[PDB]
Paper text:
Copper transporting P-type ATPase proteins are key regulators of cellular copper and are found in all kingdoms of life. To further dissect the transport and regulation mechanisms of P1B-1-ATPases, we focused on a member from rice (Oryza sativa), OsHMA4, or simply HMA49. This protein is localized to the tonoplasts of roots, and is involved in root-to-shoot translocation and grain accumulation of copper. HMA4 has three predicted N-terminal ferredoxin-like MBDs, although the one closest in sequence to the M-domain and the P-type ATPase core, MBD−1, lacks the metal-binding CXXC-motif.
We also studied the effect of no such supplementation to HMA4, which has previously yielded an early E1 state of AfCopA26. These various conditions yielded four structures, determined at overall resolutions of 3.3 (HMA4BeF), 3.2 (HMA4AlF), 3.6 (HMA4apo), and 3.7 Å (HMA4Cu). In comparison to available structural information on P1B-1-ATPases, HMA4apo/Cu are most alike the early inward-open E1 structure of AfCopA (RMSD 4.1 and 3.8 Å), while HMA4AlF/HMA4BeF are most reminiscent of the outward-facing structure of LpCopA captured using AlF4- (RMSD 1.8 and 1.7 Å). Collectively, these observations suggest the HMA4BeF/HMA4AlF structures represent early E2 conformations linked to copper release, likely E2P, while the HMA4apo/HMA4Cu rather represent early E1 states associated with copper uptake. The shifted CPC-region suggests the stretch is highly dynamic, as also observed for the E1-Cu state of AfCopA, which is consistent with a role in uptake, high-affinity binding and release. Accordingly, in contrast to AfCopA, in HMA4apo the cysteines of the CPC-motif point away from the proposed entry site, facing M3, M5, and M6, as if the protein is not yet ready to accept its cargo in the absence of metal. A In the E1 state (HMA4apo) the first of the CPC cysteines (C597 of M4) is oriented away, preventing copper uptake. This configuration is stabilized by Y912, N913 (M5) and S945 (M6). In HMA4apo these amino acids interact tightly with the sidechains of the central cysteines, with C597 being wedged in-between Y912 and N913, and with a strong interhelical cryo-EM density feature in-between C599 and S945. In line with this, the available experimental data indicate absence of the feature at the MB’ platform when copper is not available, such as in our HMA4apo/HMA4BeF/HMA4AlF, all XtATP7B and the apo hATP7B (PDB-ID 7XUN33) structures. C Close-view of the A-domain-MBD−1 interaction in the E1 state (HMA4apo).
Numbering used by the authors: 184 to 962
The structure:
């Protein structure tokens, strides 16, 4: 996408379009730089949003035409083109597989199956000349398509790679596929050279090996493609709906109209009726409206949009009429910002890949030299005839068997678990993370999180909720709860502050608990603005004095023994409380508690049994944190500790060698994440979670953590198995068909068979690394 909209003009390459636009640009204002457009392909003049953009510039380009018909321009730039490009990649590899299969399969078929039932095998044996038959010729002819045409990638893979050295997969693939066919050419040349020469040849090896390697490559890339668009859900909140509320000079009204994102630039106002999808990243000017959204968190946020509030684009209005002006472009659109994260999802670097490539530099030259030694062994042995010669297979002698066991090693070479398995597993892990709502921004984090048995936690929406919920009214003198809600609302109706707003939240809460409007709401009399001890008010004719015991003494309200009882109850768990005196007589208290993130019973009391130890170092006061620890599990607790203390303690704990992680969201909580090995964020309300972080989660429910860590460990399960499998199947079966051993104990294995022996250990590896797909969260 570009800020110079790529608009192709009406009239199929008609220059007068450009001439008229040039005249208009000389006429109209607002352009940053009026420059040539004939040299460019579209309107390539310099401009930017806000001062100009969709509305004004579309109007100008349209009006460039002779009135009333206009050069109708809306927008033309890649809306979402990754899908098409990746689908073309899939089609390319699909086409390569299709061609490579069609020629290869008959080639394998000819000298494998036909001799068994051979009414046609004699036709193959029908000699063209002195030992050069029809079958051999046709098989040779149908071999250039395989390596000389289709497999050229391998060559271009190796061409520069071996030009200086240090090798890779390409080297072994190239040598193994080339040697068999190239020696097969020589053997058939010597076959045609005489009439007493013996047959046997090897073409099927190369075709089969190339086909299977290409199939593996196809599976790898298609899995990359599938997991790449598995981000899906994240950016598909794409709104095209819009409105234009044309206003007069005083902004009263001119005309409301339905439009699209065609003309949406900044300073564009939209009316959002209920149900209608919100336009691209607007902000409310005036109007109170309930609207729900869920963008950087997964547990949803309902907000009563006041006259001025961030109404995120692509969301759902519940109820209300609001004027929504566009004031954001580019990255400030949350969709775009988290698309920089799906772009960051395309950014990763496996640390295990380092060890993989280090192994790759020890394997290939060593295996080549070990294979080479075999030919010298058999050759020196056969030249100086110092061993018996009566088990030599018929129609053969020295130069056959020597080079045959020589070639029989570069076809049994196993590595496909060093080139395919690890990238595939790493990518599928990220795909599953995105599936469950995790953005693992780097394989480094995935590898690091494998070995952790202790984590850090924090308040402020990581183990808590927002403003605390009122939980306990003791009702000293009998006043109905809903009547208390009405009285509290009437008293709070003046001087609205977040704690008083929380009192009104308790009001509302008990209202949905009861159901239905009650009595009447009376605005406060004798109102005194003082939240230091509680405000003075008169509601329903009753002197509602909401305020602590200090206020009860201030306004001379009777004190009962239940006052001291509830004081003791408050000091038990450090609720933070306030007294409500109706008619200047205390009618119960209004105790408030801050709810935690309430799944700890299932989550933290049980992941510890799975093998972690909860370390809770946090900012809230000593009493609050010790009570939180007293609620459920968690061991050592360090309260009254500012984010700095979290930083030092985590530093020493990681230095001791436990790789302790932290779970916490907030600007102040950020350095703790930065200094720590890996981070982990439930919800992305803080911007630093979108910034440098490791295991950013879509939702805010901490259950994800379980689903996170096990998954990582589970990944490093399968990978290790593959590193065993090779270090299994590779060296206990390679020396079988590697010569050197065989002058003591016989029994054959033919060179062609290893072609379908590397094959099995080149697909099952991918199957093991792909079975990561089927997975479920434990609890």
């Amino acid at each position: 996408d570009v800020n110079k909209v790529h608009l192709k003009l009406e009239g199929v390459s008609s220059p007068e379009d450009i001439k008229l636009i040039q005249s208009r640009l000389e006429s109209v204002e607002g352009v940053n730089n009026v420059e040539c457009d004939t040299a460019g392909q579209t309107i390539i003049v310099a401009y930017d949003p806000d001062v100009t953009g969709p509305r004004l510039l579309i109007q100008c380009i349209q009006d460039a035409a002779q009135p009333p018909k206009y050069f109708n321009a809306s927008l033309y730039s890649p809306p979402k083109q990754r899908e098409a490009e990746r689908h073309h990649e899939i089609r390319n590899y699909r086409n390569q597989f299709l061609w490579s299969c069609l020629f290869s399969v008959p080639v394998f078929m000819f000298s494998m199956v036909l001799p068994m039932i051979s009414p046609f095998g004699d036709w193959l044996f029908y000699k063209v000349c002195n030992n050069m038959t029809i079958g051999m010729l046709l098989r040779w002819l149908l071999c250039s398509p395989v390596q000389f045409i289709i497999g050229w990638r391998f060559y271009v893979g190796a061409y520069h790679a071996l030009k200086r050295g240090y090798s890779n997969m390409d080297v072994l693939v190239a040598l193994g596929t080339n040697a068999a066919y190239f020696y097969s050419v020589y053997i058939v040349l010597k076959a045609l050279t005489s009439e007493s020469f013996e047959g046997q040849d090897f073409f099927e090896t190369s075709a089969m090996l190339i086909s299977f390697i290409l199939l593996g490559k196809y599976l790898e890339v298609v899995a990359k493609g599938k997991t790449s668009d598995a981000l899906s859900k994240l950016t598909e909140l794409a709104p095209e709906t819009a409105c234009l509320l044309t206003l007069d000079k005083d902004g009263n009204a001119i005309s409301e109209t339905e439009i699209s994102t065609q003309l949406l630039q900044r300073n564009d106002v939209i009316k959002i009726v209920p149900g209608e999808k919100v336009p691209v990243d607007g902000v409310v000017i005036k109007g109170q409206s309930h609207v729900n959204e869920s963008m950087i968190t997964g547990e949803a946020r309902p907000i009563a949009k006041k006259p001025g509030d961030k109404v995120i684009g692509g969301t759902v209005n519940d109820n209300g009429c609001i004027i929504v002006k566009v004031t954001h472009v580019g990255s400030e659109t949350a969709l775009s910002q988290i698309v920089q994260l799906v772009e960051a999802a395309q950014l990763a670097r496996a640390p295990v890949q380092k060890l993989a490539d280090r192994i790759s530099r020890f394997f290939v030259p060593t295996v080549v030299v070990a294979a080479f030694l075999t030919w010298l062994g058999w050759f020196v042995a056969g030249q100086f005839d110092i061993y018996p010669r009566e088990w030599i297979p018929k129609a053969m002698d020295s130069f056959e068997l020597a080079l045959q066991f020589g070639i029989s090693v570069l076809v049994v070479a196993c590595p496909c678990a060093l080139g395919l398995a690890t990238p595939t597993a790493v990518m599928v892990a990220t795909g599953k993370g995105a599936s469950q709502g995790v953005l693992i921004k780097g394989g480094n984090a995935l590898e690091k999180a494998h070995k952790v048995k202790a984590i850090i936690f924090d308040k402020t929406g990581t183990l808590t909720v927002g403003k605390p919920s009122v939980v306990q009214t003791k009702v000293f003198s009998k006043i109905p709860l809903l009547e208390l809600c009405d009285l509290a609302a009437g008293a709070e109706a003046n001087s609205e502050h977040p704690l008083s707003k929380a009192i009104v939240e308790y009001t509302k809460k008990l209202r949905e608990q009861y159901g239905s409007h009650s009595d009447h709401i009376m605005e406060s009399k004798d109102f005194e603005v003082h939240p230091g001890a509680g405000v003075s008010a008169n509601v329903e004719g009753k002197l509602v004095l909401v305020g602590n015991k200090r206020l009860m003494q201030e306004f001379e309200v009777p004190i009962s023994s239940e006052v001291e009882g509830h004081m003791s109850e408050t000091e038990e768990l450090a609720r933070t409380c306030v007294l409500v005196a109706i008619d200047r007589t205390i009618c119960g208290a209004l105790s408030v508690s801050d709810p935690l993130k309430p799944e700890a019973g299932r989550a933290i009391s049980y992941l510890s049994s799975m093998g972690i130890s909860s370390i809770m170092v946090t900012g809230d006061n000593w009493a609050t944190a010790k009570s939180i620890a007293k609620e459920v599990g968690i061991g050592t607790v360090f309260a009254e500790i500012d984010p700095v203390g979290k930083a030092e303690k985590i530093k020493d704990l990681q230095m001791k060698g436990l790789t302790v992680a932290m779970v916490g969201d907030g600007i102040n909580d950020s350095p703790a994440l930065a200094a720590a090995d890996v981070g982990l964020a439930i919800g992305a309300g803080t911007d630093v979670a979108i910034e440098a972080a490791d295991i950013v989660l879509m939702r805010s429910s901490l259950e994800d953590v379980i689903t996170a860590i096990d998954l990582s460990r589970k990944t490093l399960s399968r990978i290790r198995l593959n590193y065993v499998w090779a270090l299994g199947y590779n060296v206990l079966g390679m020396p079988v068909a590697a010569g050197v051993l065989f002058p003591f104990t016989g029994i054959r294995l033919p060179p062609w068979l290893a072609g379908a022996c590397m094959a099995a250990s080149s697909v099952s590896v991918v199957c093991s690394s792909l079975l990561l797909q089927l997975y479920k969260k434990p609890l």
